[PDB]
Symmetry: C3
Subunit: 152 residues, 3 copies
């Protein structure tokens, strides 16, 4: 029993070391292209791509396109967009049913921050969504190129 | 004994929370300049350099130039090459014995994906190896500049 | 007991795996924009900004502008500057009292590596500090754009 006790004490020190070391690396890793908010992490690729390409990049990386589900998440995402000074694509589209935006899973939106008058399906061909540097949303043509930002 | 149990129960909760956090941060880390395959991790510096300089960058970083040892590893590396649209240097050279490519350790290749007609030692001076966006290999002069991709 | 001893072995296995995985990840993260020295880590954003903007970026990331406090730290920082071939801003300034450089906290410098003749407050308007590829320091106008390097 004393042997196991010694083992536990050792593990406690090793875990404490990992926690401290990892806490430091979290900050290092997110600088300058990442943003943590709650349990979610947004990270930009630093370049622009059309929706389909951006979506694939995020999915293959084990995440998905930025999908802010609260004002707080949206504000965090906005910080990255502002820092890079490039509007970015969100994950939602109304490709299936015009006028009804959904997440990649098909679920309807639980949050939105549409600019006044949006979505307006301008030209009758805007089924993707972009977030501006001011944090507001606008439906935009999926064929256009916007900043690639994924969430993990 | 009873106190040790709860101590173990607690410590493991912390470790599993650490495992989850670490796993999330690893995915974030690899986007968009890295690729994991098995226990190996490829990461590109995002710029080009001549072989000697590229090799030094990887060694100083605690790794080595990309050394795909299987079709799976080659495919993973190919993803970075395609993403950057820049052919990359591999670690192998036939500088010691012309025609015989080896890893930095001196060991002979256990896998190769030479493009048709390669390695041809063009000009009688191609002792380094580059991987194209199509995943195939070609021997090339070490003085040329290619994408820097290290493996860890 | 025999069950506790079993749980401990599993826990030990999880911690040992994390130590190996974390160590590998650290190397990946630092390549190619980071440098570890002592308990400090320098990381460059890979781009240039005026002092105020560079300072805010580091602060918002949970760190601060590079603040070498020893020859060892300065040498580590110098590596990033050399690697990017771009002089970088340090955190210190004499904005409060001309001729007296201080850290962000307000404390006086505990180490300096001024190039010959510096600081010279050229034009009567140099209150910020930059580090050259040779590791030496020079006071520079805060409005100029230099490589952003933060410390964590
Ligand atoms: Ca439509
Ligand atoms: Ca639409
Ligand atoms: Ca619109
Ligand atoms: Ca030769
Ligand atoms: Ca040759
Ligand atoms: Ca050839
Ligand atoms: Ca002054
Ligand atoms: Ca001054
Ligand atoms: Ca000066």
């Amino acid at each position: 029993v004393a042997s196991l006790r010694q083992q536990v004490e050792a593990l406690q020190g090793q875990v404490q070391h990992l926690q401290a070391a990892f806490s430091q690396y979290k900050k290092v890793e997110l600088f300058p292209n990442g943003q943590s908010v709650g349990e979610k992490i947004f990270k930009t690729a630093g370049f622009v791509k059309p929706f389909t390409e951006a979506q694939l990049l995020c999915t293959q990386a084990g995440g998905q396109l930025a999908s802010p589900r609260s004002a707080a998440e949206n504000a965090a995402l906005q910080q990255l967009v502002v820092a890079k000074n490039e509007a970015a694509f969100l994950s939602m589209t109304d490709s299936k049913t015009e006028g009804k935006f959904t997440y990649p899973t098909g679920e309807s939106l639980v949050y939105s921050n549409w600019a006044p008058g949006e979505p307006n399906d301008d030209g009758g061909s805007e089924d993707c969504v972009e977030i501006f540097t001011n944090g507001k949303w606008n439906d935009r043509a999926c064929g256009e190129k916007r900043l690639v930002v994924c969430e993990f």
